[PDB]
Amino acid sequence: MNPPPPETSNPNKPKRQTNQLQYLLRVVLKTLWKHQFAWPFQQPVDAVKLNLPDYYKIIKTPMDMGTIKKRLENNYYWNAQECIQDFNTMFTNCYIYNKPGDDIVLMAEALEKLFLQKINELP
Ligand SMILES: Cc1nn(C)c(C)c1-c1cc(OCC2COC2)cc(-c2ccnc3nc[nH]c23)c1F
Ligand SMILES: [Cl-]
Ligand SMILES: [Cl-]
């Protein structure tokens, strides 16, 4: 079945609202969110709905842009590199579970190209 989703709130974390993290929410994530290919990544993989009973037997550090959005809105991160690491985990999970040429891999590839374009320059 589905595991609990990754945590998005933690009052015990040291938190910051750097200019880069504000940018990652207002510009980077909000632009990726609107991409025609973003919809598979706007929430945790629902292994039950998608009939992927093996997905969480293989992917042990799940992540998605819905989780990232909630983290950013909770000032969950200390710095932009923590947020960028979550993005990279999302893309990498897709490439691990799936194979080149799969539709979902083509979609992640598109999103990742745009992501790298947008983070090349941060405030
Ligand atoms: C494209 C595509 N083609 N086909 C035939 C299917 C079933 C999809 C599809 C649909 C989907 O919908 C998400 C809604 C349901 O709950 C939110 C999510 C994912 C999906 C996301 C992230 N990683 C994945 N690894 C394998 N699938 C992954 C997906 F691939
Ligand atoms: Cl919180
Ligand atoms: Cl902590």
Swiss-Prot record:
Chromatin reader protein that recognizes and binds acetylated histones and plays a key role in transmission of epigenetic memory across cell divisions and transcription regulation. Remains associated with acetylated chromatin throughout the entire cell cycle and provides epigenetic memory for postmitotic G1 gene transcription by preserving acetylated chromatin status and maintaining high-order chromatin structure. During interphase, plays a key role in regulating the transcription of signal-inducible genes by associating with the P-TEFb complex and recruiting it to promoters. It is linked to Cornelia de Lange syndrome 6: A form of Cornelia de Lange syndrome, a clinically heterogeneous developmental disorder associated with malformations affecting multiple systems. It is characterized by facial dysmorphisms, abnormal hands and feet, growth delay, cognitive retardation, hirsutism, gastroesophageal dysfunction and cardiac, ophthalmologic and genitourinary anomalies. CDLS6 inheritance is autosomal dominant. A chromosomal aberration involving BRD4 is found in a rare, aggressive, and lethal carcinoma arising in midline organs of young people. Translocation t(15;19)(q14;p13) with NUTM1 which produces a BRD4-NUTM1 fusion protein. This is Bromodomain-containing protein 4. Ubiquitously expressed. It comes from Homo sapiens. Phosphorylation by CK2 disrupt the intramolecular binding between the bromo domain 2 and the NPS region and promotes binding between the NPS and the BID regions, leading to activate the protein and promote binding to acetylated histones. In absence of phosphorylation, BRD4 does not localize to p53/TP53 target gene promoters, phosphorylation promoting recruitment to p53/TP53 target promoters. It is found in: Nucleus; Chromosome. JQ1, a thieno-triazolo-1,4-diazepine derivative, and I-BET, a benzodiazepine derivative, have been tested on tumors with success. Treatment with GSK1210151A (I-BET151, a I-BET derivative) has strong effets on mixed lineage leukemia and promotes myeloid differentiation and leukemia stem-cell depletion. The record marks N98 as: Acetylated histone binding.
